[PDB]
């Protein structure tokens, strides 16, 4: 469905500026750095824990393959 037939909205005002009146990168580092840290801290112990576990099962299994191929002292 096209614009004009999407849904019903009442009593909502929207203000905006022309891109020629404004900056492309307002407060990019100033406000950007802390917002990125916030986003990173929010998801870190959802995303990271399984990949820590992969790293461990990987490095364990790799050098276990090496040990097993060595000769035994008997």
């Amino acid at each position: 469905r096209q614009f004009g037939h999407l849904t019903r909205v009442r009593h909502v005002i929207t203000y905006s500026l022309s891109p020629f009146e404004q900056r492309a990168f307002p407060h990019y580092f100033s406000k950007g750095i802390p917002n990125v840290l916030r986003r990173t801290r929010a998801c870190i112990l959802r995303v990271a824990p399984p990949f820590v576990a992969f790293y461990l099962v990987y490095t364990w299994g790799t050098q276990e393959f090496e040990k097993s191929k060595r000769k035994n002292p008997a």
């Binding site: 929207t14 203000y15 500026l17 022309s18 404004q22 492309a24 990168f25």
Partner: protein
């Protein structure tokens, strides 16, 4: 059946933007010519391929004329032998693989055209193999005609140590030590397997620069158009 993997030697072409040492290629070719070419074939390299890389047109014509090659038939319907030209490929030692086996005690010496690309480790591997021949450790002996190399898989290879000190004099008068001879031949075998090397890396630099320019420009264009929405304020005013 343990494994010793090769170390990473600092080649003159190791870096991202580093070209092949072409004077090293010129030496390395001669190491194939004098030493390998009576045992290993190198089918995909012709005498024309050397021009504008390590030899001139006139030099490569001389190198081509030096070798025998079959051609024909002719008016009477017979296969004759002629001096080589630039359009001829590097000639095979034997007529077929079954002949090659007989000459090397059952072993079939691999074609060298892609040997850098066909082995894990590449020029690091081949260099370790050529210089790494040593006497076997205690408790070890293979069947007569199988030498000990710690870098070969299964610890036993059927190739006699091919390179040693003063194996052949070089055209530019570089002292032909075993290490020098291996370094040069590897540099050549790299170019054999990957002739594109220098062009590829020239293109790499030009790509990185153009991307360095276009990515922040297009990103700025994106932020410009989207700035209408990023800035906007919403107000709910029910009566």
């Amino acid at each position: 059946d343990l494994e010793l993997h090769p170390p990473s030697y600092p080649w003159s072409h190791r870096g991202l933007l580093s070209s092949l040492d072409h004077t090293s290629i010129r030496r390395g070719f001669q190491v194939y010519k004098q030493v390998c070419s009576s045992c290993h074939s190198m089918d995909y390299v012709a005498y024309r391929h050397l021009v504008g890389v390590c030899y001139t047109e006139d030099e490569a014509k001389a190198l081509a004329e030096e070798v025998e090659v079959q051609d024909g038939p002719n008016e009477d319907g017979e296969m004759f032998m002629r001096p080589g030209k630039l359009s001829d490929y590097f000639p095979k030692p034997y007529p077929n693989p079954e002949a090659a086996r007989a000459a090397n005690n059952g072993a079939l010496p691999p074609d060298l055209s892609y040997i850098v690309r066909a082995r894990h480790g590449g020029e690091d591997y081949v260099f370790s193999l050529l210089t790494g021949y040593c006497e076997p450790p205690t408790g070890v002996s293979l069947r007569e005609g199988l030498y000990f190399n710690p870098y070969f898989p299964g610890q036993a290879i059927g190739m006699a140590p091919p390179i040693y000190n003063e194996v052949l004099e070089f055209d530019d008068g570089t002292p032909a030590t075993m290490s020098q001879v291996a370094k040069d031949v590897c540099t050549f075998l790299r170019w054999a397997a990957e002739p594109e090397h220098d062009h590829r890396k020239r293109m790499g630099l030009k790509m990185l620069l153009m991307m360095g320019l276009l990515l922040p420009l297009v990103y700025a264009m994106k932020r410009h158009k989207w700035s209408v929405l990023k800035s906007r304020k919403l107000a709910y005013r029910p009566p």
